[PDB]
Structure formats: C-alpha cells, structure tokens
Amino acid sequence: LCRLCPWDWTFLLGNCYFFSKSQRNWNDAVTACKEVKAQLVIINSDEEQTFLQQTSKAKGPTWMGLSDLKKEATWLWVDGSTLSSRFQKYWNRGEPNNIGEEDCVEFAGDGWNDSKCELKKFWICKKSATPCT
Amino acid sequence: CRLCPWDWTFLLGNCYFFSKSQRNWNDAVTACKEVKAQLVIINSDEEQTFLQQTSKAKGPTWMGLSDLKKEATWLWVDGSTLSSRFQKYWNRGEPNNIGEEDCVEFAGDGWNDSKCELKKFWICKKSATPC
Ligand SMILES: CC(=O)N[C@H]1[C@H]([C@H](O)[C@H](O)CO)O[C@@](O)(C(=O)O)C[C@@H]1O
Ligand SMILES: CC(=O)N[C@H]1[C@H]([C@H](O)[C@H](O)CO)O[C@@](O)(C(=O)O)C[C@@H]1O
Ligand SMILES: [Ca+2]
Ligand SMILES: [Ca+2]
Ligand SMILES: [Cl-]
C-alpha cells in the first residue's frame, strides 16, 4: 500500500537514498545513479550528512556527487550548484589536498576527502520520494 | 558489503523495516517476530529522530512499547523498562486515557498512547551484521 521509496531505498526527509553494495569509479557511479533516474548524492542538510556519514563508515569509502572537474579548486554538485560555505566544515583536516590530481569527493571516516576519480568506491543515489495521500 | 536484509535500513548497527501496511498492535508484534525482529524499541535519540520523521510521511505508526503487563508502567516488548531520559518524547497531554489506550505510537513530533485494537503502520528492528 504505502511505499515512499523504491524497494530497498531508504527514506529521509522527503527523499530516497540508495546505498550501493558494490564499488565503482566516480563517473560510472554517476551513470549508475542516472540509470535509476537519480543523482549521485548531493548534500544540502546536516541531518543528511550525519545519516549518510554513519552508513558509509560501516561500509567504507563512498563517493558523493561533488567534484572540481570543471575547474580546479571550484567544487560543484552534479546539479551544477556550487559548494556552500555552510558545508566546508565537513572537509577533513588536511582536505582538500592534491588539488588537480584528486578531483572527486568521498566520505572518509567522519568527513570528506577529495580523491582520484579513477578509484572504485561505494556510492549513493538520491532522488525525491512519493507521498501517501 | 550488505549491512541489512533487502528492503531494510541500516542505522547505528541496527536494521529497520518500515511496513507498507497497517496492523493492530499485537499483529505488528507478530509480524516482527516473523523476521527475527521486534516491534521497534528506542534506545537512542538519533534513532528516535530518524523514526519520528519517517513515520510523519506515512501516518501513525506503532512502536514496541505498552503497559499491558501493568496499567501505568510502560515496558518495551523485550521486557525492559522505559527510561527517564526518554520520557521527554511523550507529546504534551500524553500518556492519557490510562487503562484504555495501552499501546504507544509515533504521532507527529512525539509519542501518543492509543487503543491497541487500532490498525496502524509499524516498524521492526533487529541487529545488523557488519562488513
Ligand atoms: C599515500 C601517502 O603516503 N600519503 C597520503 C596522505 C595520507 O592519507 C594522510 O597523510 C593520512 O591519512 O593523504 C592522501 O591520502 C590524500 O587524502 O590525498 C594522499 C597521500 O598520498
Ligand atoms: C475525568 C478523568 O479522569 N479523565 C481522564 C483524563 C483525560 O483522558 C486526559 O486528561 C486528557 O484529556 O486523564 C486520564 O487519561 C489519565 O491520565 O488517567 C484518564 C482519565 O480518566
Ligand atoms: Ca585528498
Ligand atoms: Ca491518547
Ligand atoms: Cl537479503
């Protein structure tokens, strides 16, 4: 009867998140989320970052939909929006480093790293949920 | 790496299943027992927060709390006593209708007590398996 998210996706605050069980490079992951009409995960709330951060820690490193592939040092979400000042706090100390060599962002432990996009990692999709009358 | 069974949500070392249908309280207990889980027991505030918002999207939802053993004492389905640190979650004006509304539900932003005969959504919880 009342189903908020696709089967095996988790509901959180009006959206549905899918946690990959396997690992892929950054671009593939984008493609993988695209294939289910979703986006490699974009963060725009702290409750979200807290929920996503904890899941990832139990699995391991996990890609999010953030990168500076358009322009070194500028960090864009796949929807084109710029990284907000309110989120810089999520960088781990010593991150981001290796600018121009590590162009994609991952959850790592308790914060974000930038990394070689070529590496395979777990990933996460996000799309909007569907209500119940 | 699979933390929880298919269509179950991982949270802080446990697994959660959200029903798509509604059942009276005792049935819901049964349903949980069918999959080696319990009608949900809260023991953390991050947990209470997650469930609360999830229920909101669906509708009133049962948890594994009741005073069926003894009017006015609220025990979890596992027999454990309700903690002082969690009393804050009763909505204002809850618990009421004591001795007539014997089971606890998520309702809005806190907990109500309700007639156990009512059909409501439910949530099961059981421990996860790591990677
Ligand atoms: C492999 C190595 O020797 N040092 C690595 C350090 C260490 O990880 C940190 O000093 C502590 O973890 O930082 C990187 O991983 C990073 O995030 O870009 C790359 C770098 O090559
Ligand atoms: C006259 C009277 O006793 N009324 C009832 C009230 C009201 O239900 C609440 O005040 C909410 O309006 O309180 C009880 O729930 C309670 O706490 O035991 C039962 C009680 O029988
Ligand atoms: Ca880095
Ligand atoms: Ca009531
Ligand atoms: Cl399974």
Side-chain angles (χ1 to χ4, degrees):
Chain A
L1 284 165
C2 178
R3 198 176 64 94
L4 291 163
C5 288
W7 297 94
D8 209 38
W9 294 48
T10 289
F11 172 90
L12 172 65
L13 296 174
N15 299 295
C16 303
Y17 300 81
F18 170 81
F19 303 91
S20 91
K21 5 212 117 305
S22 67
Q23 315 193 70
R24 292 202 198 176
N25 81 28
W26 191 80
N27 286 96
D28 289 347
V30 171
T31 293
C33 293
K34 203 183 297 182
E35 293 177 340
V36 289
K37 295 190 186 182
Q39 55 207 42
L40 180 57
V41 63
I42 290 172
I43 308 192
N44 40 7
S45 97
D46 290 74
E47 181 170 348
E48 171 179 9
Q49 153 67 33
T50 304
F51 181 72
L52 296 188
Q53 190 74 66
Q54 65 98 46
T55 310
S56 305
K57 203 171 172 185
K59 288 212 201 270
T62 310
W63 294 124
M64 72 189 75
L66 188 61
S67 74
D68 66 351
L69 294 168
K70 198 168 167 58
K71 186 205 288 176
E72 200 161 343
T74 312
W75 298 95
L76 301 177
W77 297 102
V78 296
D79 71 342
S81 73
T82 61
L83 180 57
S84 158
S85 307
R86 82 183 268 251
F87 295 135
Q88 291 205 19
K89 58 183 181 195
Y90 291 121
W91 290 114
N92 285 310
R93 187 185 78 254
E95 304 277 340
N97 59 352
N98 297 116
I99 297 167
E101 299 298 343
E102 291 174 346
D103 291 303
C104 293
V105 193
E106 71 178 2
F107 302 93
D110 308 278
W112 304 349
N113 292 5
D114 60 351
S115 296
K116 287 185 281 183
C117 294
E118 307 90 70
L119 296 177
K120 293 176 181 178
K121 300 179 188 286
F122 297 109
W123 75 94
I124 302 171
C125 306
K126 174 182 180 173
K127 59 168 144 182
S128 45
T130 304
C132 294
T133 166
Chain B
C1 178
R2 190 179 56 86
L3 294 160
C4 285
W6 182 90
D7 208 38
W8 296 57
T9 294
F10 170 92
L11 176 67
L12 297 179
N14 294 305
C15 302
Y16 296 81
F17 177 86
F18 304 88
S19 85
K20 292 93 178 71
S21 72
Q22 317 195 40
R23 294 193 201 169
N24 75 24
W25 189 77
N26 284 92
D27 286 346
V29 166
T30 292
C32 288
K33 292 191 151 184
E34 289 247 41
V35 288
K36 206 199 179 297
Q38 275 158 329
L39 185 58
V40 61
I41 294 173
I42 318 271
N43 41 7
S44 99
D45 180 278
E46 185 169 349
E47 168 177 9
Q48 149 61 31
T49 310
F50 176 64
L51 295 186
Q52 187 71 64
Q53 62 93 43
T54 303
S55 306
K56 263 196 195 171
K58 287 214 197 188
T61 307
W62 293 123
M63 72 186 74
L65 186 63
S66 72
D67 66 350
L68 292 164
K69 199 167 168 59
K70 184 212 289 174
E71 202 164 344
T73 55
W74 299 94
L75 299 176
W76 293 101
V77 295
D78 77 344
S80 75
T81 60
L82 178 57
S83 157
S84 304
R85 79 181 267 254
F86 295 136
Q87 290 203 17
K88 59 189 179 198
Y89 295 116
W90 293 108
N91 284 307
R92 189 189 80 254
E94 302 278 336
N96 62 353
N97 301 121
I98 289 166
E100 296 297 319
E101 289 173 339
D102 290 301
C103 299
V104 191
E105 70 176 3
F106 303 95
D109 304 274
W111 308 350
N112 292 5
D113 62 353
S114 301
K115 286 192 283 183
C116 292
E117 62 199 322
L118 293 176
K119 293 172 184 175
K120 299 180 189 285
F121 295 101
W122 82 97
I123 296 169
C124 304
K125 172 188 174 179
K126 60 163 151 183
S127 44
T129 302
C131 296

